[PDB]
Amino acid sequence: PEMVRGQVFDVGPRYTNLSYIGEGAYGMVCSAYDNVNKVRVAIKKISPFEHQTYCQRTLREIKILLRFRHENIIGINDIIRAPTIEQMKDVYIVQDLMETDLYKLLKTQHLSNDHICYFLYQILRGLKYIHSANVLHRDLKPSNLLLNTTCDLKICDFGLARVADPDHDHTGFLTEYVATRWYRAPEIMLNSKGYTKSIDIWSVGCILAEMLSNRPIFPGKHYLDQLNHILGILGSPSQEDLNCIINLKARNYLLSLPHKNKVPWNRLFPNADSKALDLLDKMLTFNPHKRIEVEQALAHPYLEQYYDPSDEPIAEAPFKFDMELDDLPKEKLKELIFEETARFQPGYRS
Numbered sequence: 151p152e153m154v155r156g157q158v159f160d161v162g163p164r165y166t167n168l169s170y171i172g173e174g175a176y177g178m179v180c181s182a183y184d185n186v187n188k189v190r191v192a193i194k195k196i197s198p199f200e201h202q203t204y205c206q207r208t209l210r211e212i213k214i215l216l217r218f219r220h221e222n223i224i225g226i227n228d229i230i231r232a233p234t235i236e237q238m239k240d241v242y243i244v245q246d247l248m249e250t251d252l253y254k255l256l257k258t259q260h261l262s263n264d265h266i267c268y269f270l271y272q273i274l275r276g277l278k279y280i281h282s283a284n285v286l287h288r289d290l291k292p293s294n295l296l297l298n299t300t301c302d303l304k305i306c307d308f309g310l311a312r313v314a315d316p317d318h319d320h321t322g323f324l325t326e327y328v329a330t331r332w333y334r335a336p337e338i339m340l341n342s343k344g345y346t347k348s349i350d351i352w353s354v355g356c357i358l359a360e361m362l363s364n365r366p367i368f369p370g371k372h373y374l375d376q377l378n379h380i381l382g383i384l385g386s387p388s389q390e391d392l393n394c395i396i397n398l399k400a401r402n403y404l405l406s407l408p409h410k411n412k413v414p415w416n417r418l419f420p421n422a423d424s425k426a427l428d429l430l431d432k433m434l435t436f437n438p439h440k441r442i443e444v445e446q447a448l449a450h451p452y453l454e455q456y457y458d459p460s461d462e463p464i465a466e467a468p469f470k471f472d473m474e475l476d477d478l479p480k481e482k483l484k485e486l487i488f489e490e491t492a493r494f495q496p497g498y499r500s
């Protein structure tokens with residue numbers, strides 16, 4: 151049955167007591183009462199089938215979340231769709247109900263040094279598990295960090311994730327959407343090198359800076375304006391850092407730039423723990439090759455109160471895409487989706 155203002159939710163009879171929460175990109179988001187687990191849950195109504203790009207993101211998220219198990223990563227409790235592929239044009243993903251997200255909270259609260267500390271630890275702990283699976287989130291930002299308490303953070307939205315391929319660099323600038331602009335590492339914008347774990351560390355860096363001041367550290371209007379913001383704080387890059395600029399066209403808008411001095415961090419963030427600011431510096435390195443890696447970040451003195459390699463799981467097996475799906479007809483992907491969501495349909499054998 152089921153309804154809720156406007157668009158009606160083909161959930162139930164399991165899920166009831168609906169109550170609109172918010173909006174997704176191409177789907178709605180309510181909270182329901184799960185009458186099996188006897189708790190309130192969140193249900194994402196997803197209809198992506200019209201543009202093939204939406205079916206990529208939806209399929210990637212399901213395949214990845216369905217194989218990940220980690221306490222700082224959202225899971226999929228239930229997927230429910232129509233019986234017939236032909237009859238399927240919505241898909242409902244059931245996930246644990248979370249109270250808010252780091253974006254919503256940064257709109258209403260400055261965070262103590264302490265809370266920031268264990269928020270960052272939980273981010274990197276989940277990131278450690280993602281990277282050990284040979285996976286890149288690629289869209290880490292505050293609104294993709296769901297929060298229940300200061301001790302319950304879960305990374306969500308794996309719509310842009312990729313298996314890591316330092317070699318799969320394609321140099322297609324407009325060929326891919328990689329990171330929301332404010333959290334996009336420089337090598338993405340300079341080389342189109344969006345297949346290395348370095349890009350996620352940059353994003354986390356940006357999140358750390360945003361926690362320290364409640365405002366995003368590099369808020370560019372467009373990709374070139376994003377670079378001016380980066381250089382305005384980091385400063386004009388070195389010769390060596392202009393050597394990993396493969397886009398031979400890219401070295402120019404740089405070279406035709408007025409040298410900018412490096413803004414000392416304690417000047418940007420004078421109330422922040424000097425240890426926070428040291429880690430920030432390792433994470434916001436212009437050159438991907440010199441940027442700190444996730445396990446090194448966890449080991450940083452700033453997180454020494456929580457670091458515990460024995461209580462930080464890694465993936466049992468590197469992840470693998472059974473067939474790459476960049477250029478697949480959008481009805482093939484809807485096929486592949488109907489397939490992957492078969493787990494949660496009656497009679498599913500094997």
Ligand SMILES: Nc1ncnc2c1c(I)cn2[C@@H]1O[C@H](CO)[C@@H](O)[C@H]1O
Nearest residue numbers: 172179192245246247248249251293
């Ligand atoms: N599990 C959840 N619990 C609570 N809210 C959720 C979710 C999920 I998945 C999504 N949302 C809503 O989408 C925003 C993050 O993109 C969130 O801020 C929210 O508007």
Ligand code: NA
Nearest residue numbers: 294306307308
């Ligand atoms: Na999401």
